[PDB]
Symmetry: D2
Subunit: 259 residues, 4 copies
């Protein structure tokens, strides 16, 4: 199959990448980063995320694989087992599995769109952060506090977890909204609890006074001036992993957080 490899940039990753390419050359396997069928990410969850954002238009289409070295949540392979992976990919014993993604829409006074693998957060630019939270066109709460976080199911182990969020198995078709430091008084009454929305539900953040926000999708923070609305829904797009065995998710959670 057509394949390509990204590496973190350090010595180890770059060497692994050249060795794996050399090993694929022995097989009916062509390198191609324009239209790849498999993407292999070497380094860690940062280089994986970068690869995901490199190929947002071809997600349909691509099966991702991660290598690195505490595996975390976007890898099931270590450098000392890469040769075994070349062979198994080789021909061809997997195993496609898909995780839900998150779509963010920002409207002004031209609409901008973003796909997240982990989460999207909103904060104030200037002073107070105050926002009306509208669910399916119906007002839910007037939030005042630090910010809000909408997470994918795979994203729930990251920022979402710090904020009091539920940890969700990544197969579940949903997105999850957590508060950052809500005032929660009688003027700005909020739910407190993390909220989990199914497919087709849209959450809308509507400014009450100040219309400037810091929005950050996965890695990247952007300042948005004169925002009329921010919209959240489960994306139509999914991310696909090439799986060679059942991904032991709850075991990873144990190994990461428990220990």
């Amino acid at each position: 199959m057509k394949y390509m490899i990204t590496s973190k940039g350090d010595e180890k990753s770059d060497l692994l990448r050249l060795n794996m390419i050399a090993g694929f050359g022995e097989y009916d396997m062509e390198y191609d980063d324009v239209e790849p069928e498999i993407v292999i990410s070497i380094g860690g969850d940062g280089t994986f995320l970068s690869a995901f954002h490199q190929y947002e238009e071809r997600l349909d289409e691509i099966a991702f694989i991660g290598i690195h070295t505490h595996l975390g949540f976007y890898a099931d392979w270590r450098p000392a087992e890469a040769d075994k992976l070349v062979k198994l990919l080789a021909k061809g014993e997997y195993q496609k599995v898909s995780y839900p993604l998150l779509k963010t829409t920002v409207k002004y006074g031209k609409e901008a769109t973003y796909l997240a693998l982990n989460e999207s957060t909103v904060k104030s630019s200037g002073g107070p952060f105050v926002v009306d939270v509208v669910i399916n066109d119906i007002h839910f709460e007037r939030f005042r506090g630090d910010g809000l976080c909408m997470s994918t199911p795979s994203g729930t182990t990251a920022y979402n977890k710090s904020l009091g969020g539920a940890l969700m198995h990544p197969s579940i078709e949903a997105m999850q909204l957590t508060e950052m430091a809500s005032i929660n008084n009688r003027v700005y009454r909020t739910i407190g609890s993390p909220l989990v929305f199914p497919k087709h539900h849209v959450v809308s953040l509507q400014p009450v006074n100040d219309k400037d926000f810091q929005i950050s999708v996965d890695h990247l923070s952007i300042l948005h001036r004169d925002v009329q609305e921010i919209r959240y829904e489960v994306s139509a797009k999914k991310i696909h992993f090439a799986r060679f065995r059942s991904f032991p998710f709850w075991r990873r959670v144990h190994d990461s957080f428990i220990e």
Copy 2:
């Protein structure tokens, strides 16, 4: 269609019941409380819970309709809209349920329970200490007051009070939540609520004391010689008769934010 109506027992619930029943006299709908097609519950979520459990062998046969003499989370009908409900008496919409299996160390067979809201586990007196096993792999040793496994529709009740996420009831899941964990040198728990898909099994295994207070919805039984309590999303679902799309998040707002 065959039908029956349950009531809270108070003045208003019994009156509205006799009213609807007289309202079903004009049409080809016979009263039957042995094998009915529609169960109508009047009096709120406690009442609705009792009707669900009254007919849990015939869940594949029944559509439930809740009337709250008010609304809650299992009723979309007020006791003045009743007249327009009788006339209409639909799409059958399904909520996911929770299977609880209690396995014993003595010559007694496993007991299975279905929950619409939650199943909880606490000790019978002394400290509560249990090993949590997910898909046959030790996940944590929990010490604390107890544990709570919620259905998606149960997330608005006890689960919410414990720090759980609220989930739209259409989502195929169960959510595990902690009651007053201990975290110290010895005990380390995850802390966070955990949301499992269908086909996953969370197993509770005793460490020192085999006696547990296990609650299923309203009902809490003292269980002895317990060797394992097992949780999973049930293959069975409850069916609601929906005459309009249920505004779930609006109902969360009204109960909690208004």
Copy 3:
């Protein structure tokens, strides 16, 4: 000084007690378990708690000391292997008294009053309670229960409920919620509440008057309760301390390492 020793009853603690009693025979110190000036607890916080509850009518006149084998925890500053230093130091009188606040609970129906070293809890067994602060309605709580903690008790059950850990010198009590429903009909504050001396917190049933009330230790089923009242006790517990008590390092050693 008149003094007495309690051990938990296992051999190791029983025989440290006997050998401390003999070591004290060499000085001007008299074994007296009716009116002691020094209570020594050997074996753990369970034993120290029982000692505190045995001598609560003379908290005025007693200084406490705890000895313990493992991680010393919050009510001991001595391990067995140091017992001979303590005997000498105590006997030469080389210590400073240090005090912790306590919690008074009053249960009305007739009237019952209780002192706590750690905490006092209220659970039902449909627990709806009106929470009244300094005679003013504060909230109507519905949930599993409520917990009022002393400063020293903040590392126990209070901690599991989301409460602040407080240094045991601060004159206060701390109220925490267990599983408040916190809706439209039963709005609660959520946060733990820290009260100074002379403030009074009153729990008043709205429907069912039966409650499981706990005071440290002892859970009592109180029948037909009209009111449970909390306030910082006028009484304090006194420790004989031979150096600065390293409270925050004990928090670390219990919870972090």
Copy 4:
């Protein structure tokens, strides 16, 4: 007595100011900005915080009182309609001075800061990692969004939003909360808010980045090449002119639970 008046700067508050200054002319009451003995704030806890900070070099000689021109918050015990009644009582001097504890922050690169509400530490943009040292002994290694040290009167503010306990402002203490700590068997923290007495010092020591966004109440400055941030209860207090018992828990009820008459 010598007095001055700060307003939020909306017409409502600016006019109340001029009405009161005129009212005080019926008495022996001297308007003075440099050396006031009574600072009156008009327009909310934010306006009160600014006034405090204007006169933090002379806290022992000033008694503060607040009028809140919307509702009232936690620092204003007076409504705009009670202004004239307040003009009289102040002119008599029928008030007890009640003091609240303050928080001192020291930053070493030494700059020191007083807070009436809190002081927070966040990172520039990178991960926030700091060693937390209590009374010269390492307590935990914190990684997360930030840390917040509150005064007792500041517990009703940001501290509360972070899961902090609400404390009566008479209590001589400071309270430390976590902002979105990471707990993953590498960065284990206590989780619980911590309440320190007087004379205890909490020390934040950088690990692998020495640049921090430090906040003190309203004010937020980027400190570079920081070696240490130290917190402790200040020896300085703020004094309020009290004409009647401040009903703190009722104000907590009104703000956070409900207010069925207003």
